Structure 1
Amino acid sequence: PLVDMENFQKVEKIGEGTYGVVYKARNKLTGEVVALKKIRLDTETEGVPSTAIREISLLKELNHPNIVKLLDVIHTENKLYLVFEFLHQDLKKFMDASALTGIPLPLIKSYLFQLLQGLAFCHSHRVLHRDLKPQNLLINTEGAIKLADFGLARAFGVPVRTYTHEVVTLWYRAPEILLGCKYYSTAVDIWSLGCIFAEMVTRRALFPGDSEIDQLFRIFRTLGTPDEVVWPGVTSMPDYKPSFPKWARQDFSKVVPPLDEDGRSLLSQMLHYDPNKRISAKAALAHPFFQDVTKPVPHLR
């Protein structure tokens, strides 16, 4: 345990937070570069955090090319280390760097295609990511992208109930969650992807809400205010108010201009209101939009 930590050489503090810290480290014996996530365990003396419990058991049960790989877990007396394969950058930082030139559509399609595969793999193994956002998506220099950060992931062999302190950051939160639905479903993840898809295409976030209600409204303002015909049951949801300003559905060709016909078809299916009618990751991978997909390499900085 302590013998293993001795074989690691710290390199640079990739990031950090509440969880712990995430350094870039090098294996002294093999030369292998890894992402070391240090978690201090005395910050509660309640044992191991629940997010660690879930990310570990679920991650080490999800072996797929498009899902970050957990290489090891070192449990000492006061610290817990998660050893991940190291990837050069996250999608958020990448999008910033591509602000001027934009991300090539072929690379955008390559990335969406891959994300849909790792996601489909998750759902078929009864796992909900529940936190799909740009910074939790990692890319490498080979043009590959992987789902990472499974701290809020849930296994759904049994329905997962809606919880207030464990939800996707606002901008990527699905309308069902905002309107107060009782349970999560695989659709909440597809919705996050749809928002990221559009964000890559336009270089700007699709629904940048300031509050839960402002978030809802920006969505209504673009997709239109949903009604019982479009989404059977909306009006009967916990936070649905009949006093909602009735907006009309913007023209997609004006929301995501850069996209062709197929691109728009897919995005609209990923952003469908009724979570029961929203496209599945499995089905999405079959959309004509990925007819000519390729695997371009990014221009990492």
Structure 2
Amino acid sequence: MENFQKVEKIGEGTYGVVYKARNKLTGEVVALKKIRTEGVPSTAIREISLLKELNHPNIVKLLDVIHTENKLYLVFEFLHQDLKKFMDASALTGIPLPLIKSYLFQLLQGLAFCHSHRVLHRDLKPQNLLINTEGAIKLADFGLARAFGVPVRTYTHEVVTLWYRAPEILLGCKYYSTAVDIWSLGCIFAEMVTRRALFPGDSEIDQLFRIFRTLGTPDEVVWPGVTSMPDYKPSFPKWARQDFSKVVPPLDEDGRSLLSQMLHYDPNKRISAKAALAHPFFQDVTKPVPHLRL
């Protein structure tokens, strides 16, 4: 692109590298993502284009889609910091509960909007949740996984995180439901509260086994159909479920209650974003302003 001027590289997504750029025209500063391949799929540039209409205050706005020279550039609004960075910065002290509750509340509104438009994220994680000084938090990279498909690593040599991957995906399901996003968000919710990733797997089986060790190895009782899943093995060790009081202390009972419904094994039983918004946990929700040092 000749219009912009790569101010800085603000990260390396799984679908390409993201740059902060100043538009020599509008002068506006935006986030410029260079996607990945012999010319980029055509069904892809059509799916992505549809997301320009998926506008919501809790969804990073996709300003433009430019397919040129068999290269794909996505232009997004720019936010100054991602949640992973804010958590690392807040670890010594921990993000205050009121601000954790506000972010979760906003993320669920974002998901509710996307899910109502039959759009799933599929790859939610702290690194693509963006915050601003006004206390807002927004979902980035929505719909990208759909158009494309998470490969071995990423666009290039660099491991993709599995820490937030729903169990049905790890067990080989072919069709993903909106429930996969709820699972990811529950994982992020727990990480904000405890200041440590909930299920930091370093391999697919390790990821699954970390989930089993904490929530109990799933069976036909809690998850009808699970033993019929593609990657399910009768040889999986049988671990007992641990109490949530031990999983996310010292989170209160409303919080633990909501988290438990967000981490139900059966995707059909997992709480929807719409319903999570009505949970007693958000009875006293407010919108605190974060402390960002840009």
TM-score range normalised by the length of the shorter chain: 0.7 to 0.9
1:54–1:151 Cα contact (<8 Å) kept: no
Instruction: Provide the C-alpha distance between the structure 2 equivalents of 1:17 and 1:159, rounded to a whole number of angstroms.
Output: 13
Deviation of 1:27 (Å): 3.2
Taking a change above 3 Å as real, the CA distance of residues 33 and 165 of structure 1, as seen in their structure-2 partners, is closer
Counterparts in 2 of 1:228 and 1:162: CA distance versus 1, 3 Å: farther
Q: Distance in 2 between matches of 1:24 and 1:228?
A: 48
Match of 1:174 in 2: 166
What are the superposed Cα offsets for residues 217-260 of structure 1, whole Å, 9 maximum, x if unpaired? 11111111122111112222222222322222111111101211
Could you list the per-position Cα deviations for residues 55-93 of structure 1 after superposition, in whole angstroms to 9, with x for gaps in the alignment? 732421211001111122344446543221110011111
CA–CA distance in 2 between the matches of 1:103 and 1:213? 31
Cα pair 1:161 1:183 within 8 Å, conserved: no
Q: State how far apart, in whole Å, the 1-side matches of 2:110 and 2:252 are.
A: 25
Distance in 2 between residues matched to 1:296 and 1:93, nearest whole Å: 18
State the Cα distance separating 1:213 from its structure 2 match.
1.6
Which residue of structure 1 aligns with residue 22 of structure 2? 26
Alignment partners' CA distance in 1, 2:147 and 2:40: 18
Does the CA-based 8 Å contact 1:58-1:155 persist in structure 2? no
- CA gap of 1:25–1:172, structure 2 versus 1, over 3 A, is same
| Alignment of structure 1 residues 7-22 onto 2, 5 Å | 7-16=3-12, 19-22=15-18
Check whether the contact 2:153–2:159 (CA below 8 A) recurs between aligned residues.
Answer: no
C-alpha contact 1:62 1:122 (8 A) present in aligned 2: yes
Report the alpha carbon displacement of residue 17 of structure 1 after superposing the two structures with TM: 5.9
Q: What is the rounded CA distance, in whole Å, between the counterparts of 2:147 and 2:15 in structure 1?
A: 20
On the 8 A contact 1:25/1:33 being kept in 2, the answer is yes
Match of 2:182 in 1: 190
Deviates more, 1:64-73 or 1:46-55: 46-55
* 3-state SS in 1 of match to 2:232: coil
- How has the CA–CA distance of structure 1 residues 54 and 109 changed in structure 2, closer, same or farther, with 3 Å as cutoff? farther
The two structures have a TM-score, normalised by structure 1, of 0.86
Gap runs ≥5 in structure 2 = none
Quickly say closer, same or farther: Cα 1:216–1:77, change in 2 above 3 A.
closer
Q: CA deviation at 1:129?
A: 0.7
Q: 1:215 to 1:50 in 2, by over 3 A?
A: farther
Stretch deviating more after TM superposition (17-26 or 114-123): 17-26
Q: Confirm or deny: 8 A CA contact 1:162 1:182 kept in the other structure.
A: no
What is the distance in 2 between the residues matched to 1:293 and 1:63? Answer: 24
Within a 5 Å distance, the mapping from 1:246-261 to structure 2 comes to 246-261=238-253
Q: Distance in 1 between matches of 2:246 and 2:25?
A: 55
In structure 2, the partner of 1:205 is: 197
Q: Deviation of residue 268 (structure 1)?
A: 0.2
> What displacement does 1:47 show?
2.7
Change (3 A) 1:33 1:159: closer
Taking every aligned residue pair, what percent have the same amino acid on both sides?
A: 100
Aligned residues: 293
CA distance in 1 between counterparts of 2:277 and 2:107 reads 10
How far has the Cα of 1:164 moved from its partner? 16
- 1:120-173 superposed Cα distances (whole Å, 9 cap, x missing partner): 111111111110011011111111111112364328999999999999731111
1:260–1:50 distance in 2 versus 1, CA, 3 Å: farther
- CA change 1:37–1:152 in 2 (3 A) is closer
Compared CA separation, residues 52 and 24, structure 1 to 2 (3 A): farther
Q: Kindly indicate whether the alpha-carbon contact (under 8 Å) linking 2:108 and 2:274 is maintained by their aligned counterparts in 1.
A: yes
TM-score in terms of structure 2 length: 0.88
* 165 and 280 in structure 1: CA distance in 2 versus 1, 3 angstrom threshold: farther
On the 8 A contact 1:133/1:172 being kept in 2, the answer is yes
1:171–1:209 Cα contact (<8 Å) kept: yes
Query: Which segment is superposed worse, 129-138 or 31-40?
Result: 31-40
Alignment correspondent of 2:93: 101
Aligned position for 1:62: 54
* RMSD of aligned Cα (Å): 4.0
Deviations 1:191-212 (Å, cap 9, x if unpaired)?
A: 0001000010000011111222
| In 1: Cα distance, 2:51 partner to 2:107 partner | 16
Deviations 1:258-287 (A, max 9, x none): 211100000000000111101011111111
1:31 aligned counterpart, secondary structure: coil
- Paired with 2:11 and 2:159, the residues of 1 have a C-alpha distance of 21
Question: Of 75, 78, 97, which residue of structure 2 is paired with 1:86?
Answer: 78
Superposed CA offset, 1:23-51 (max 9, x none): 212234544221122457xxxx7333579
